[PDB]
Every structure is written in structure tokens, then in C-alpha cells.
Design an enzyme around this catalytic site. Structure first.
Site, PDB file in Angstrom:
ATOM      1  N   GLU A  11       3.871   1.209   0.012  1.00  0.00           N
ATOM      2  CA  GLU A  11       2.339   1.583  -0.291  1.00  0.00           C
ATOM      3  C   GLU A  11       1.668   0.814   0.668  1.00  0.00           C
ATOM      4  OE1 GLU A  11       2.638   4.428  -3.334  1.00  0.00           O
ATOM      5  OE2 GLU A  11       1.072   3.892  -2.138  1.00  0.00           O
ATOM      6  N   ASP A  20      -5.023   8.150   1.250  1.00  0.00           N
ATOM      7  CA  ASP A  20      -3.569   8.200   1.099  1.00  0.00           C
ATOM      8  C   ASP A  20      -2.984   9.438   1.585  1.00  0.00           C
ATOM      9  OD1 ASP A  20      -3.348   9.316  -2.545  1.00  0.00           O
ATOM     10  OD2 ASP A  20      -3.765  10.373  -0.804  1.00  0.00           O
TER      11      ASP A  20
HETATM   12  K   LIG Z   1      -0.281   3.959   0.540  1.00  0.00           K
END
Ligand SMILES: [K+]
Ligand SMILES: [Cl-]
Ligand SMILES: [Cl-]
Length: 164
Positions: A11, A20
Site C-alpha cells: 500500500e 487509490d
Molecule cells: K495504496
């Protein structure tokens, strides 16, 4: 290697609100804020989460705090989900981390569509499970990450995260 190091790799870490892979406002270590297209709405969610008026920017410490809460909550939700807990309990620690990672990314509801793949994992039919997981929108949309997670479920080793 452990779940936190693993998810930190997948992430990244950003201290300002960003979008995202799905286009949704997020911050920190994969902390989803909202699916709303409103930045203001995302900022409100961030303030609620951190407990202060942030203006869209947080500290590394704060990012880590939300991260800890997210992983904890993810595991906990897995344990309360009757469709997932048995899978989780059937696996070794390495594969368990892979499953927490998947849920952190797709959510429990996301995992609802993985019944078949999960079943192959419960049967310990590694190769078949791997093949099956790749036949998904998840795999098609984030293939590099998916490949990593799948190799983990297939081998039960952290080889895919080494060198990262
Ligand atoms: K991310
Ligand atoms: Cl939160
Ligand atoms: Cl990817």
C-alpha cells in the site's frame, strides 16, 4: 516479514490525501476514506478518523495509528465472518497474512465472490487455488499485487515480498 510489513509494501505510505487504484480518496497506509467523489467529504472522514481538523494532511505517526487499527479490524472482521473464519483458521500463519491482506484490500463484501478460491485454500489444493484466484476482476485490475498474494497462498512462503 509480517502482515504490517507486507501491507506497508503493497500500500505504500502517503501523508496527504490521494486516490487509490480505484480512484477513491485514501491516506496513510492504504486507509480508505470514502468512495465519494467529494474531496470535502473525504476530508471530513479524515478529521473524524484522526480526531482533529487536519486539512487533508497527517503525520507518519497518525498514519501508523490508523494502519494498526485497520489491520486489527481486518483480522477481527475475518474472525466474525462465518464465511471466512473457517478458512482463516485452517491456514498456517504465512497464508493467513495473505488472506488478511486480500480482505484489507477488497473488503469482506469483496471476498464474498471468492467462495471457490477460498474453498480450494481450505482444501489445501494450493495450485488449484492459485489458478482460481487469478480468474477475477481483482487479479485483472491489480495484477502485480495479486500475483504476489497468490504466490503466497500457493507456496506458504514470503519469497514474493523479498527484495521489496
Ligand atoms: K495504496
Ligand atoms: Cl477510522
Ligand atoms: Cl498491482
Amino acid at each position: 516479514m509480517n502482515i504490517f510489513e507486507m501491507l506497508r509494501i503493497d500500500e505504500g505510505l502517503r501523508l496527504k490525501i490521494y486516490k487509490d487504484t480505484e480512484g477513491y480518496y485514501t491516506i496513510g497506509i492504504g486507509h480508505l476514506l470514502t468512495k465519494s467523489p467529494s474531496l470535502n467529504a473525504a476530508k471530513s472522514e479524515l478529521d473524524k478518523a484522526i480526531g482533529r481538523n487536519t486539512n487533508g494532511v497527517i503525520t507518519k505517526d497518525e498514519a501508523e495509528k490508523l494502519f494498526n487499527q485497520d489491520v486489527d479490524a481486518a483480522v477481527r472482521g475475518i474472525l466474525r465472518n462465518a464465511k471466512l473464519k473457517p478458512i482463516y483458521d485452517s491456514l498456517d500463519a504465512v497464508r493467513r497474512a495473505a488472506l488478511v491482506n486480500l480482505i484489507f484490500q477488497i473488503g469482506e463484501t469483496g471476498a464474498a465472490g471468492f467462495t471457490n478460491s477460498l474453498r480450494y485454500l481450505q482444501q489445501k489444493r494450493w495450485d488449484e487455488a492459485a489458478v482460481n484466484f487469478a480468474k477475477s476482476r481483482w487479479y485483472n485490475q491489480t495484477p502485480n499485487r495479486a500475483k504476489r498474494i497468490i504466490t503466497v497462498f500457493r507456496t506458504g512462503t514470503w519469497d514474493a515480498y523479498k527484495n521489496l
